[PDB]
């Protein structure tokens, strides 16, 4: 209880709510799901001044993502869609459309905000560990075992982010990851130590 509360306190210094009208209850639900992430990662995101921006409109309607209008995201080739249609972005920043958390809401992640925040942890906190030799070996064996083989199975950083989301979303996804991807699960367990 106290650890979840500490994580919510840390997130209060990371999450940026949109100006204007937005679904406050769903924004709170997204923060609560993010609070399941191990506090060491959250504290490191705060120290690096990473902001998790929750949005009520399209990502590319924000001034800082306007440059992505018409750009085809990695792994979205052939879909006829561009960044204008993507609900969640992670990496050097994090930007997330409120209401689009669940799989199928314009994206394929088990949870939008955990997946995007995993990219920021990978890139900012862990210095692109998903592209390290160690993780590439794990990805070579287990990277297709969550499905979405043309996305998760092709880009190790995507398999990392999705695995991270399974690890932290809830007890069921955590158990599913352990059964499907035992080496990835052990990798994530050891990373948090």
């Amino acid at each position: 209880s106290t650890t979840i509360q500490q994580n919510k306190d840390t997130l209060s210094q990371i999450v940026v709510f949109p100006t204007g009208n937005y679904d406050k209850n769903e924004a709170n639900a997204m923060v609560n799901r993010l609070a399941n992430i191990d506090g060491k990662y959250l504290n490191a995101l705060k120290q690096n001044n990473l902001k998790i921006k929750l949005l009520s409109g399209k990502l590319t309607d924000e001034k800082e993502y306007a440059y992505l209008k018409g750009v085809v995201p990695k792994g979205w080739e052939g879909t006829g869609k561009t960044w204008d249609d993507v609900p969640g972005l992670g990496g050097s920043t994090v930007a997330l459309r409120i209401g689009f958390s669940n799989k199928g809401k314009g994206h394929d992640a088990i949870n939008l905000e955990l997946h995007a925040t995993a990219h920021a942890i990978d890139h900012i906190v862990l210095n692109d560990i998903s592209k390290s030799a160690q993780f590439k070996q794990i990805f070579a064996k287990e990277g297709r075992s969550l499905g979405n083989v043309n996305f998760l199975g092709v880009y190790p950083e995507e398999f990392f982010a999705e695995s991270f989301a399974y690890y932290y979303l809830n007890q069921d996804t955590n158990s599913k990851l352990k059964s499907a991807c035992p080496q990835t699960y052990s990798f994530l367990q050891n990373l948090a130590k």
Partner: peptide
């Protein structure tokens, strides 16, 4: 960096 950006990722979907």
């Amino acid at each position: 960096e950006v990722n979907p």
